[PDB]
Amino acid sequence: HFADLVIQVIDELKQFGVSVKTYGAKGDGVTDDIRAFEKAIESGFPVYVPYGTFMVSRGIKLPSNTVLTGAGKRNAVIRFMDSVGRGESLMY
């Protein structure tokens, strides 16, 4: 309960803007983080992606005027889950 206050101080500092973990992203290579992304992008803020394997169950949609910068190649990873259907691009 203590760490959550420290986190929510940083999440309002917005060093890179709004982090995607602020909206409930794990990036643990298992958890479906799709809803965290959609929320972060529609907020109107530059979305940042820190370290982790951010799994996804459906394609990430990108509206107008979006800034999406991560921590690097093989650092901030975005992946489709082993049970995603057909017809969608990972990012579009």
Out of 1, 63, 64, 74, the residue judged to bind its own copies by CB under 8 A: 74
Please identify which residue in the block is written with the tokens 């060093």.
15
Please, what is the minimum distance in Å from the beta carbon of residue 88 to its own copies? 27
16: contact with its own copies by CB under 8 A = yes
Chosen residue from 5, 64, 87, 92 binding its own copies by CB under 8 A: 5
- Decide if 81 contacts 57 (C-beta within 8 A): yes
Work out whether 1 is an interface residue with its own copies (CB under 8 A): no
Neighbours of 42 (CB within 10 A): 13
Indicate which single residue of 31, 34, 39, 45 sits in contact with its own copies (rule: CB under 8 A). 45
DSSP 6-51: HHHHHHHH-SSSEESGGGT---EEEEE-HHHHHHHHHTTS-EEE-S
Residues in touch with its own copies (CB under 8 A): 2-3, 5-7, 9-10, 13-17, 19, 21, 45-46, 50-52, 65, 67, 69, 71-75
